[PDB]
Design a protein around this ligand. Structure first.
Ligand SMILES: *[C@@H]1O[C@H](CO)[C@@H](O[C@@H]2O[C@H](CO)[C@@H](O)[C@H](O)[C@H]2NC(C)=O)[C@H](O)[C@H]1NC(C)=O
Ligand code: NAG
Ligand code: NAG
Ligand code: NAG
Ligand code: NAG
Ligand code: MET
Length: 605
């Protein structure tokens, strides 16, 4: 165990903390019910990262190789680190920065890396909400806007790119975003998304005006709504035409795929983002309730209420992906049948889906010169499932075309998008708490000002920085920041704290501490998973990320309607300067830990 001098006289004495609890009646807020606490920590570690990043990170890796590693890494790392951070948040009685500043005070960097990364994530995790509510505004009309192609100035046919692609892709790629051909090409500001950005950053600031005592009621409402609308959509999904053909595709593991470092790294970077570990949000939430609270129970139940709603959203999403795939397959087959009969004049009900191959052999032996002119298609299932589906285009290109092929669609669409909105709002509640708490714990604003002014300043600042995603070339910036800021700094912060708690604070002190708090030493499981397995797994994930960054080309997809075979996605490389951004997003917020450590150890000569 590292020396760590002066650990006492900086933290409460373990024998007088229940006396300190009385001073917490006025200087700190407190939860009204236990239910509010469990719901807020349940509404913070769920949503938009189980529907918008999970199925993409599943499909890219086939679809079956991202469910075994995810669950192993869950049961091995998501639970123990979460229990650890709950227990600290309750013992040390301070926010997300005052804790890591009491353990070996040269470790205040974590209080800054966590703040910076919870800011960088919230920078775009709000413009996603902006797009969602822009879609929600376009409902409330009986013919859905994305159900037809608009005609040109010369009313004879559809516009070009609406004809060569789906009618729903000419609502996301040309009417909503108006995407330009390349990231180096950026144009106007696109007011009609400034409106939605302002509305999103206003709803958020209208809900979290005072930290707690104002997220309470919004947690009562917007953390139970998704758990009934999700079931309503599951019941409708499993009775579709193409169900049981997608959810069976989800669970067939391509065994030679989970033997690649890429899938392991993706599961590792996703199990920390499905929760909110290393964000600095759960420390502060678990720093309010009373002392003699059974910190274990809550931890375990939350760990098993989220990891369950992670395969309960994968089922509902793949139950729609399979439906869309089998629909396109039947359409291709009907088109082939039609191209055959229009060419040979056969009756209507003699070429059906089972005697097709024999009937096609039965014509080529009768008109060999008339047959070898028809351009047949090719279409087989298990090739329409693994298609070009990416984030920002999984919950807006799939669910919005399968929502218009059901009766009374102007209701299902509104229900689905209110589900997504009230599923993504909670997360931002927690994140804004995790960015506001360490700021006023830094004495950055004179303490005589109210809390509303600081929340308003943060909201205005992040809104004004959020003009970068509303340009034409806007979806590319978002894809880039999403990838890198969700991948790299999270796991390094998590490892650094998981090491600092068990090897700088002592594990035995923490042990008898939790013993006095709840009333029993933790089982052997927690001991073994805290002392050896958790840091060892982390190192592996780290090296895998470092071996999955070199030797893998850095490419992004463009739209470019002028390029031939246009329905397919064209893939190019970023310009050279982009690495600069890749630093300022994956650097400073994950390098201020050793930087501050060196600054503090070289201040003391
Ligand atoms: C199952 O995963 C393997 C990887 O282990 C896939 O094999 C790759 O397939 C792509 C096809 O685009 C090739 O470019 C790679 O060279 C293959 N790699 C290896 C190591 O064989 C395989 O395609 C996957 N299964 C299916 C049905 O696609
Ligand atoms: C439609 O008609 C107008 C006038 O007849 C013509 O100028 C225009 O070019 C036509 N549209 C196209 C796409 O050619
Ligand atoms: C979409 O962007 C193009 C730039 O390529 C611009 O000319 C056009 O005006 C934009 N759409 C609308 C409706 O303004
Ligand atoms: C379709 O027509 C062919 C020729 O008229 C006939 O042999 C075949 O039996 C018909 N289909 C069925 C299902 O009877
Ligand atoms: C059609 O029959 C000819 C033999 O007359 C053969 O050479 C050709 O490959 C056949 N085409 C198909 C599609 O079977
Ligand atoms: C500011 S956290 C962003 C979303 C949330 N943490 C989640 O994992 O769903």
């Amino acid at each position: 165990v590292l020396p760590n001098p002066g650990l006492d006289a900086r933290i409460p004495s373990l024998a007088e903390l229940e006396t300190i609890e009385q001073e917490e009646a006025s200087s700190r807020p407190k939860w009204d019910n236990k239910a509010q606490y469990m719901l807020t920590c349940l509404g913070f570690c769920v949503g938009l990262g189980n529907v918008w990043r999970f199925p993409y990170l599943c499909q890219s890796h086939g679809g079956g190789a991202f469910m075994i590693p995810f669950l192993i890494l869950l049961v091995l790392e998501g639970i123990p680190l979460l229990y650890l951070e709950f227990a600290i948040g309750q013992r040390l009685r301070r926010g997300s920065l005052g804790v890591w500043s009491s353990i070996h005070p040269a470790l205040k960097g974590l209080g800054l890396a966590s703040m910076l990364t919870s800011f960088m994530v919230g920078l775009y995790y709000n413009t996603i909400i902006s797009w969602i509510m822009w879609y929600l505004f376009n409902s409330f009309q009986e013919p859905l806007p994305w159900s037809d192609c608009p005609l040109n100035e010369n009313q004879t046919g559809y516009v070009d790119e609406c004809a060569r692609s789906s009618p729903v892709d000419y609502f996301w790629y040309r009417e909503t975003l108006n995407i330009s051909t390349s990231i180096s090409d950026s144009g106007s500001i696109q007011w009609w998304m400034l409106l939605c950005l302002a509305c999103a950053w206003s709803v958020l600031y209208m809900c979290t005006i005072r930290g707690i005592e104002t997220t309470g009621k919004a947690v009562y409402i917007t953390s139970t709504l998704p758990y009934v609308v999700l079931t309503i959509f599951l019941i409708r999904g499993l009775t579709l035409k193409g169900a049981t053909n997608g959810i069976v595709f989800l669970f067939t593991p391509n065994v030679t795929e989970l033997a690649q470092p890429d899938t392991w790294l993706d599961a590792g970077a996703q199990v920390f983002f499905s929760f909110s570990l290393a964000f600095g949000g759960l420390i502060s939430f678990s720093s309010y309730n009373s002392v003699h609270n059974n910190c274990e129970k809550d931890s375990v139940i939350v760990s098993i209420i989220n990891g369950f709603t992670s395969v309960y959203v994968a089922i509902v999403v793949y139950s729609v992906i399979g439906f869309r795939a089998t629909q396109r397959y039947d359409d291709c087959f009907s088109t082939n049948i039609l191209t055959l009969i229009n060419g040979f004049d056969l009756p209507e009900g003699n070429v059906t889906q089972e005697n097709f191959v024999d009937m096609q052999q039965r014509c080529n032996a009768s008109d060999p010169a008339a047959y070898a002119q028809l351009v047949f298609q090719t279409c087989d299932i298990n090739a329409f499932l693994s298609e070009a589906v990416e984030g920002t285009g999984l919950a807006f290109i799939v669910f919005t075309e399968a929502i218009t092929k059901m009766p009374l669609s102007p209701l299902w669409s509104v229900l689905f998008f209110i589900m997504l909105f009230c599923l993504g709002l909670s997360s931002m509640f927690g994140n804004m708490e995790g960015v506001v708490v360490p700021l006023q714990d830094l004495r950055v604003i004179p303490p005589k000002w109210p809390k509303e002014v600081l929340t308003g300043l943060i909201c205005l600042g992040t809104f004004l920085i959020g003009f970068i995603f509303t340009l034409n070339s806007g979806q590319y910036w978002l894809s880039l920041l999403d990838s890198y800021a969700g991948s790299i700094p999270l796991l390094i912060i998590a490892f650094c704290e998981m090491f600092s708690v068990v090897y700088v604070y002592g594990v035995d002190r923490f042990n008898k501490d939790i013993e006095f708090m709840i009333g029993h030493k933790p089982n052997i499981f927690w001991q073994v998973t805290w002392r050896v397995v958790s840091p060892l797994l982390m190192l592996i994930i780290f090296l895998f990320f470092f071996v999955v960054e070199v030797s893998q080309e850095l490419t992004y997809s463009i739209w470019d309607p002028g390029y031939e075979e246009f329905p397919k996605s064209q893939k190019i490389s970023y310009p050279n300067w982009v690495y600069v951004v890749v630093v300022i997003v994956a650097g400073v917020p994950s390098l201020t830990i050793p930087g501050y450590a060196i600054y503090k150890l070289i201040r003391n000569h």
